[PDB]
Design a protein around this motif. Structure first.
Motif, PDB file in Angstrom:
ATOM      1  N   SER A   1       4.208  -5.014   5.002  1.00 54.91           N
ATOM      2  CA  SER A   1       4.719  -5.128   3.581  1.00 54.91           C
ATOM      3  C   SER A   1       5.912  -5.637   3.555  1.00 54.91           C
ATOM      4  O   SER A   1       6.668  -6.514   4.712  1.00 54.91           O
ATOM      5  CB  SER A   1       4.671  -4.214   2.691  1.00 54.91           C
ATOM      6  OG  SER A   1       4.342  -4.422   1.196  1.00 54.91           O
ATOM      7  N   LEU A   2       5.714  -7.407   2.747  1.00 54.69           N
ATOM      8  CA  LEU A   2       7.372  -8.286   2.741  1.00 54.69           C
ATOM      9  C   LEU A   2       7.542  -8.137   1.110  1.00 54.69           C
ATOM     10  O   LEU A   2       6.830  -7.790   0.221  1.00 54.69           O
ATOM     11  CB  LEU A   2       6.389  -9.644   3.221  1.00 54.69           C
ATOM     12  CG  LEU A   2       6.022  -9.691   4.561  1.00 54.69           C
ATOM     13  CD1 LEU A   2       5.512 -11.049   5.001  1.00 54.69           C
ATOM     14  CD2 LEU A   2       7.694  -9.462   5.355  1.00 54.69           C
ATOM     15  N   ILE A   3       8.500  -8.950   0.528  1.00 54.66           N
ATOM     16  CA  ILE A   3       8.912  -9.364  -0.669  1.00 54.66           C
ATOM     17  C   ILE A   3       8.428 -10.548  -0.276  1.00 54.66           C
ATOM     18  O   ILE A   3       7.633 -10.526  -1.855  1.00 54.66           O
ATOM     19  CB  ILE A   3      10.493  -8.846  -0.565  1.00 54.66           C
ATOM     20  CG1 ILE A   3      11.384  -8.002  -0.704  1.00 54.66           C
ATOM     21  CG2 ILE A   3      11.103  -9.539  -2.289  1.00 54.66           C
ATOM     22  CD1 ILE A   3      12.647  -6.917  -1.133  1.00 54.66           C
ATOM     23  N   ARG A   4       8.573 -11.325  -0.176  1.00 50.86           N
ATOM     24  CA  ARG A   4       7.949 -12.704  -0.375  1.00 50.86           C
ATOM     25  C   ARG A   4       7.460 -13.141   1.195  1.00 50.86           C
ATOM     26  O   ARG A   4       7.607 -13.232   1.801  1.00 50.86           O
ATOM     27  CB  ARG A   4       8.751 -14.060  -1.123  1.00 50.86           C
ATOM     28  CG  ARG A   4       9.868 -13.925  -0.111  1.00 50.86           C
ATOM     29  CD  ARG A   4      11.027 -15.252  -1.016  1.00 50.86           C
ATOM     30  NE  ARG A   4      11.033 -14.665  -2.539  1.00 50.86           N
ATOM     31  CZ  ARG A   4      12.765 -13.344  -2.316  1.00 50.86           C
ATOM     32  NH1 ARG A   4      12.930 -13.055  -1.128  1.00 50.86           N
ATOM     33  NH2 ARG A   4      12.744 -12.637  -3.378  1.00 50.86           N
ATOM     34  N   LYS A   5       6.435 -14.011   1.138  1.00 46.49           N
ATOM     35  CA  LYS A   5       5.862 -15.005   2.116  1.00 46.49           C
ATOM     36  C   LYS A   5       7.401 -15.179   2.892  1.00 46.49           C
ATOM     37  O   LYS A   5       7.473 -15.845   2.718  1.00 46.49           O
ATOM     38  CB  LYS A   5       5.017 -15.745   1.986  1.00 46.49           C
ATOM     39  CG  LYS A   5       3.685 -15.164   1.841  1.00 46.49           C
ATOM     40  CD  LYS A   5       2.280 -15.644   1.357  1.00 46.49           C
ATOM     41  CE  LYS A   5       2.890 -17.534   0.859  1.00 46.49           C
ATOM     42  NZ  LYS A   5       1.035 -18.241   1.529  1.00 46.49           N
ATOM     43  N   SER A  94       2.416 -12.026  -1.191  1.00 38.99           N
ATOM     44  CA  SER A  94       1.379 -11.893  -0.299  1.00 38.99           C
ATOM     45  C   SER A  94       0.506 -11.142  -0.465  1.00 38.99           C
ATOM     46  O   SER A  94      -0.131 -10.474   0.320  1.00 38.99           O
ATOM     47  CB  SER A  94       2.749 -10.847   0.754  1.00 38.99           C
ATOM     48  OG  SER A  94       3.559 -10.124   0.378  1.00 38.99           O
ATOM     49  N   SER A  95       0.685 -10.931  -1.167  1.00 38.87           N
ATOM     50  CA  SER A  95      -0.827  -9.553  -1.667  1.00 38.87           C
ATOM     51  C   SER A  95      -1.021  -9.742  -3.475  1.00 38.87           C
ATOM     52  O   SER A  95       0.112 -10.907  -4.073  1.00 38.87           O
ATOM     53  CB  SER A  95      -0.008  -8.639  -1.671  1.00 38.87           C
ATOM     54  OG  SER A  95       0.499  -7.354  -2.701  1.00 38.87           O
ATOM     55  N   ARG A  97      -1.016  -7.012  -5.393  1.00 42.59           N
ATOM     56  CA  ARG A  97      -0.319  -6.225  -5.811  1.00 42.59           C
ATOM     57  C   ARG A  97       0.938  -7.295  -6.671  1.00 42.59           C
ATOM     58  O   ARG A  97       1.724  -7.192  -7.782  1.00 42.59           O
ATOM     59  CB  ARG A  97       0.438  -5.380  -5.647  1.00 42.59           C
ATOM     60  CG  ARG A  97       1.310  -4.245  -6.269  1.00 42.59           C
ATOM     61  CD  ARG A  97       1.371  -3.413  -5.481  1.00 42.59           C
ATOM     62  NE  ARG A  97       0.619  -2.460  -5.434  1.00 42.59           N
ATOM     63  CZ  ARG A  97       0.316  -0.649  -5.821  1.00 42.59           C
ATOM     64  NH1 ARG A  97       1.491  -0.505  -5.130  1.00 42.59           N
ATOM     65  NH2 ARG A  97      -0.024  -0.202  -5.620  1.00 42.59           N
ATOM     66  N   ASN A  98       1.319  -8.536  -5.302  1.00 42.79           N
ATOM     67  CA  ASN A  98       2.484  -8.802  -5.575  1.00 42.79           C
ATOM     68  C   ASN A  98       2.080 -10.331  -6.641  1.00 42.79           C
ATOM     69  O   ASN A  98       3.329 -10.914  -6.730  1.00 42.79           O
ATOM     70  CB  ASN A  98       3.056  -9.857  -4.468  1.00 42.79           C
ATOM     71  CG  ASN A  98       4.480  -9.421  -4.355  1.00 42.79           C
ATOM     72  OD1 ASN A  98       5.527  -9.695  -4.824  1.00 42.79           O
ATOM     73  ND2 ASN A  98       5.276  -9.618  -2.898  1.00 42.79           N
TER      74      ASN A  98
END
Ligand code: N17
Length: 341
Positions: A1-5, A94-95, A97-98
């Motif tokens: 998982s990431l905060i942003r790409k 990145s998803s 949800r994001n």
């Protein structure tokens, strides 16, 4: 998982948080709008200046998501030098949800006709600008897309008077100075020449420096319009599907039309003739874009090779669909992933 790409940085633009790929540097506030905001930036891969529009909460409702998707698809579809188009499209998400927003990347346009209007242009500048307008309109019309709200604020120009049409294919007492009478009064069904009326209104304003048609309500704007077009005769009147409007027209003092030579006493004969043929109430006699491009007013600039048509009609497909916000996010996400510059 990431905060942003990866390869994205966070920077404040006009006191709001933007997330941009590394290749776009030096972001500078340009404007805040009704559904997003725009900055300019440099593509360091080539040093070219681009505009980046950050969509503002496009996924808050189905209306917002459909709107955002439509802008994306319309920008993607058109490939014409006088129609604004899509250089790039991205999201820091990145998803799903994001996934909260996305960004459109377009060629940077310095200003627009509304900002440089008010003043009287040379007829050569009018020739060049209107020629570009009509090429762009011929293209989007050939894709089956009408503008319907063409106005000087919708016509972006750079410093060399290169022009691009903005906001194609999208109450109270909003200004409607450039809208066709059949749209304001809905007194007959319209076609693509609704945009040509607008071109006339804009061209007149360039020739004179004065807005051609105003009015506090639709009846007053109609009175101002008939001052110029004259009260229309029985051939036009028979085409009205609004019986009350028909009766109103037939009961007016039947004032004859033109001498646009008299109305525009500084315009050339060719300019006044073209204006005569664009500011025409009868939607079946008003010039199309393709027909207006053949007019003598554009002879110094005319290049039929530049007057291209779209190879495919604009085709969406989901335009009538009623989906969930989640499903719209899925489709928009797919489109962003599948884009190629
Ligand atoms: C809500 C909606 C919008 N659209 C839509 C359709 C087609 C084009 C545009 C548009 O031009 N958009 C646009 C115009 C100007 C922009 O800002 C600049 C500023 C400076 N240079 C270039 C672009 C950004 C996007 C918008 C359809 N539904």
């Amino acid at each position: 998982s990431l905060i942003r790409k990866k390869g994205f940085y966070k920077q404040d633009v006009n006191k709001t948080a933007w997330e941009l790929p590394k290749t776009y540097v030096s972001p500078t506030h340009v404007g805040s709008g009704a559904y997003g905001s725009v900055c300019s930036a440099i593509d360091k891969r080539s040093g070219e200046k681009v505009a980046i529009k950050k969509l503002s909460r496009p996924f808050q409702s189905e209306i917002f998501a459909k709107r955002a998707y439509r802008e994306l698809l319309l920008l993607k579809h058109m490939q014409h030098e006088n129609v604004i188009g899509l250089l790039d499209v991205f999201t820091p998400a990145s998803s799903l949800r994001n996934f909260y927003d996305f960004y459109l990347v377009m060629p940077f346009m310095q200003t627009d006709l509304q900002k440089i209007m008010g003043m009287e242009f040379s007829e050569e500048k009018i020739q060049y600008l209107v020629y570009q307008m009509l090429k762009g309109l011929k293209y989007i019309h050939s894709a089956g897309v009408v503008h319907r709200d063409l106005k000087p604020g919708n016509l972006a120009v750079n410093e060399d008077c290169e022009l691009k049409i903005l906001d194609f294919g999208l109450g109270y007492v909003v200004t409607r100075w450039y809208r066709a009478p059949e749209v304001i009064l809905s007194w007959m069904h319209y076609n693509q020449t609704v945009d040509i009326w607008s071109v006339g209104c804009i061209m007149a304003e360039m020739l004179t420096g004065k807005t051609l048609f105003k009015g506090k309500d639709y009846l007053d704007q109609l009175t101002q319009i008939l001052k110029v077009t004259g009260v229309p005769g029985t051939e036009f009147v028979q085409k009205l599907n609004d019986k009350a409007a028909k009766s109103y027209i037939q009961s007016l003092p039947q004032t004859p039309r033109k001498d646009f030579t008299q109305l525009f006493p500084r315009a050339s004969p060719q300019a006044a003739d073209l204006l005569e043929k664009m500011l025409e109430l009868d939607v079946d006699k008003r010039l199309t874009a393709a027909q207006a491009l053949t007019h003598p007013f554009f002879e110094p600039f005319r290049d039929p090779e530049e007057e291209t048509e779209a190879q495919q009609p604009f085709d969406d497909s989901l335009e009538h669909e009623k989906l969930t916000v989640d499903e719209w996010k899925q489709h928009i996400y797919k489109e962003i992933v599948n884009f190629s510059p």
